[PDB]
C-alpha cells in the first residue's frame, strides 16, 4: 500500500524480481491486478488460464490487464482448476512472484467450492451436500433458516426464496453449485433436438461449451462473447447437448424470431417443436419442446391476459433442463431477476456480449445464473476473421451558435433535445449516409431520442423503427434492409440496440445516446460487428461513427461510453471535420432553416 511520490502504488518492497523474467510475461501486484504481455511467445497459454481466474479489465493489442476477485476465482474452481494448480502455474508465469497476500487470497476463495450443492427435482429445491458440518453452519445463519421450507443431508427450501438463499450462501463463503446432471436424468424426457452436421462450431464456441461441459454434468453460468460472434449457435448447441426441454428468454419480439430462425438453421428440431410466447402471437406454447419468449412477457408483474395467463400457468408448472437467458446483463434488474424463480430450471446458461452495467448489480450474475464461464477476446476474434473489423470514429460536430446560446443558459433537462437536434450534427449524418450509400454499404443509424429519430427519418426519408412500430412492421423493415437493395439505410431506436442480426450492415452511425451507457455503446456497435461475406481480416470491413456536439455535455458521455470498447482494444479516432461536406447539397444550409429547427426543439419541451 506504499505510495510513491508520483501517486503510484509502490510495490517494490512487496515482491522480488525473477531472474528469468524475460521469458515470464506476467506481473502480479498485491492489489491483484495482473499485467500480461501480448507480445510474449507464451501468450496463448497464459491468456486462457488468466481469463478464467481473472476477468479482463483492459486488453489493448500489446499489454493486457486483469483483476483478481473472489467471483473471478470461484469461476476457476468450477471449470476444473484447483488452488495448487492455479497458484503453481501463476508462480510459473509470474516474472515477479505472487505476494503472500494474494497467495493466501487465492487459497481462501478455493476452499468454498463443492461444500454445498443445490439440486432441483420433482419441482422441489433442495440444499445438497456431502458434509453435514457445512449444512449445520448454514442453519445457524438466520436468513438461511428463515427461507427454509415452512453421508449426504438435504433440506428443502421454498422456491420463492432461492435468490436470498443463493446471495447469503456466497456471503457465507459457501457457493451453491447449481450443477445439472442431465446425462443421469431420465425423469425428464429427452427431446429430439440434434445438431445437424452442417453446423460446425468455431474454436471459441467449442471452447466455451467445453468449460460448460467439462465433466459429464452440465455447468450453469454466464458465457460472454463479442456481439456477432454467434452466441445463438452456442446457445443452440447447449440445448443439443442437454437434449431436454429448453427455454430461451430473448429481449424483445425481434430476439425470439431470430432465436427461432437460428434453431431451425443450426438444429434439426422440427418447426412444430419450436414455439414463441409473445404479445404478437404464440405457436401453442402448451405443446412445445423448446419455448422462446421475452423477459417482458415472463417478467410481467401485472395480471396477465387469459391468453398469456394460460401459458404462464404451464410454464410455472414445468421442469426445464436448460434455461438460456439471452442478454444476461439485464437479468439483475429488479423484476427481470424474478423470472429465474418464476420458471423452474436446472441449468441456467447465460449468453451476452457486454457484461457491464452502470450500477454495481452486474456482480449479482455470479449467483443468479453462475460464474462467468468464458469470455472471448474481441481482438483475437477480430484478427481471426470471426468478427468484422470496425474502424470506430467520433465525428466532432461543432454546436450551432444559435443553439449553444440556448444550451448554455438552459439547464432544466432540455439540453438533451438541444444538442441531439444539432443542425451541424444533422449535416454530418446526412453527408455520411450519402457517401456511404454510394459505396454500397448497408448503413444503420441509432438514436435514443425518438424525437431526434423521427426528425432525421422524415427529413432524410428513411425508414425508422422504435417503440410504437408493430412487431410485423419492424420485422418487415429488417427483411427489406437485409435483402432489398433499395433500403440501404435504416433508423433504429433503443429497441434495436441488442439482438439485431444484420450481417451485411457494414456502416453504423449514432446521433444520440442514453448517457454514458457502456452497455449501450458496445451493444450498438455490435449490430455491424457480424462477420461479412467478402470480409478481409485487416481491411476494416465495417465502420462505426458516434456523432457528437463539440463543447457540449455529449463530449463527457462520449468519452464515458467509449470506456468498454477501448478496454477491448478498439481505438476511437477523432474526426474534427469531414472533407467534401462543403461541396455537398446538405440540409440546414441556411440560418432560416436552422432558426426554424431551434424553435421547434424549444417547443417540444
Amino acid at each position: 500500500t506504499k505510495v510513491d511520490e508520483y501517486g503510484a502504488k509502490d510495490y517494490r518492497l512487496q515482491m522480488p524480481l525473477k531472474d528469468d523474467h524475460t521469458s515470464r510475461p506476467l506481473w502480479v501486484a498485491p492489489d491483484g491486478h495482473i499485467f500480461l504481455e501480448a507480445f510474449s511467445p507464451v501468450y496463448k497459454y497464459a491468456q486462457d488460464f488468466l481469463v478464467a481466474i481473472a476477468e479482463p479489465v483492459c486488453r489493448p493489442t500489446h499489454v493486457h490487464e486483469y483483476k483478481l476477485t473472489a467471483y473471478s476465482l470461484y469461476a476457476a474452481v468450477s471449470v476444473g482448476l484447483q488452488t495448487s494448480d492455479i497458484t503453481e502455474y501463476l508462480r510459473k508465469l509470474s516474472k515477479t512472484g505472487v505476494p503472500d497476500g494474494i497467495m493466501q487470497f487465492i487459497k481462501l476463495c478455493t476452499v468454498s467450492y463443492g461444500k454445498v450443492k443445490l439440486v432441483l427435482k420433482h419441482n422441489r429445491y433442495f440444499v445438497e451436500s456431502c458434509h453435514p458440518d457445512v449444512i449445520q453452519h448454514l442453519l445457524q445463519d438466520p436468513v438461511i433458516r428463515e427461507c427454509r421450507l415452512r453421508q449426504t443431508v438435504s433440506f428443502e427450501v421454498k422456491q420463492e426464496m432461492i435468490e436470498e438463499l443463493q446471495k447469503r450462501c456466497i456471503h457465507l463463503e459457501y457457493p451453491l453449485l447449481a450443477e445439472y446432471d442431465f446425462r443421469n436424468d431420465s425423469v425428464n424426457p429427452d427431446i429430439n433436438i440434434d445438431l445437424k452436421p452442417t453446423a460446425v462450431l468455431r474454436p471459441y464456441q467449442e471452447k466455451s461449451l467445453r468449460k460448460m461441459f467439462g465433466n459429464g454434468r452440465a455447468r450453469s453460468g454466464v458465457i460472454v462473447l463479442p456481439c456477432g460472434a454467434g452466441k445463438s449457435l452456442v446457445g443452440v448447441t447447449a440445448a443439443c447437448t442437454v437434449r431436454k426441454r429448453c427455454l430461451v428468454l430473448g429481449n424483445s419480439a425481434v430476439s425470439v424470431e431470430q432465436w427461432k430462425a437460428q434453431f431451425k438453421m443450426w438444429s434439426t428440431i422440427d418447426d412444430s417443436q419450436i414455439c414463441r410466447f409473445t404479445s404478437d402471437a404464440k405457436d401453442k406454447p402448451i405443446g412445445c419442446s423448446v419455448a422462446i419468449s421475452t423477459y417482458s412477457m415472463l417478467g410481467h408483474t401485472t395480471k396477465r391476459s387469459w391468453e398469456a395467463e394460460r401459458v404462464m400457468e404451464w410454464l410455472k408448472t414445468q421442469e426445464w433442463g436448460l434455461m438460456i437467458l439471452d442478454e444476461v446483463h439485464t437479468i439483475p434488474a429488479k423484476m427481470f431477476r424474478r423470472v429465474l424463480t418464476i420458471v423452474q430450471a436446472h441449468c441456467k446458461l447465460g449468453l451476452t456480449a457486454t457484461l457491464v452495467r452502470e450500477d454495481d448489480k452486474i456482480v449479482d450474475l455470479n449467483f443468479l445464473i453462475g460464474p462467468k464461464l468464458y469470455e472471448a477476446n474481441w481482438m483475437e476474434l477480430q484478427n481471426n476473421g470471426y468478427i468484422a473489423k470496425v474502424q470506430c470514429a467520433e465525428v466532432w460536430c461543432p454546436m450551432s451558435p444559435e443553439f449553444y446560446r440556448e444550451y448554455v443558459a438552459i439547464k432544466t433537462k432540455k439540453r438533451i433535445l438541444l444538442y441531439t437536434m444539432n443542425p451541424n450534427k444533422f449535416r454530418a449524418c446526412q453527408f455520411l449516409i450519402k457517401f456511404h450509400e454510394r459505396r454500397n454499404d448497408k448503413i444503420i443509424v441509432f438514436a435514443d431520442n425518438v424525437f431526434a429519430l423521427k426528425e432525421y427519418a422524415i427529413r432524410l426519408n428513411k425508414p425508422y423503427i422504435y417503440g410504437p412500430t408493430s412487431q410485423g412492421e419492424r420485422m418487415q423493415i429488417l427483411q427489406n434492409f437485409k435483402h432489398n437493395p433499395k433500403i440501404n439505410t435504416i433508423f433504429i431506436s433503443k429497441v434495436g440496440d441488442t439482438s439485431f442480426d444484420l450481417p451485411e450492415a457494414n456502416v453504423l452511425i449514432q446521433i444520440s445516446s442514453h448517457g454514458g451507457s457502456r452497455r449501450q455503446e458496445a451493444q450498438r456497435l455490435g449490430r455491424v460487428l457480424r462477420a461479412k461475406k467478402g470480409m478481409v481480416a485487416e481491411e476494416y470491413n465495417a465502420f462505426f461513427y458516434s456523432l457528437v456536439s463539440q463543447d457540449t455535455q455529449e463530449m463527457a458521455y462520449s468519452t464515458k461510453r467509449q470506456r468498454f470498447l477501448v478496454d477491448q482494444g478498439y481505438s476511437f479516432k477523432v474526426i474534427t471535420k469531414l472533407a467534401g461536406m462543403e461541396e455537398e447539397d446538405l440540409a440546414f444550409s441556411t440560418k432560416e432553416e436552422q432558426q426554424q429547427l431551434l424553435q421547434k426543439v424549444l417547443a417540444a419541451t
Binding site: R439, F543, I575, T576, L578
Partner: peptide
C-alpha cells in the same frame, strides 16, 4: 476497390 474516405484514412487534426 472501395478505399476508405480521407478522414478515416489519415489524421484530420490540424497539428
Amino acid at each position: 476497390a472501395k478505399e476508405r474516405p480521407i478522414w478515416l484514412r489519415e489524421s484530420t487534426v490540424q497539428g
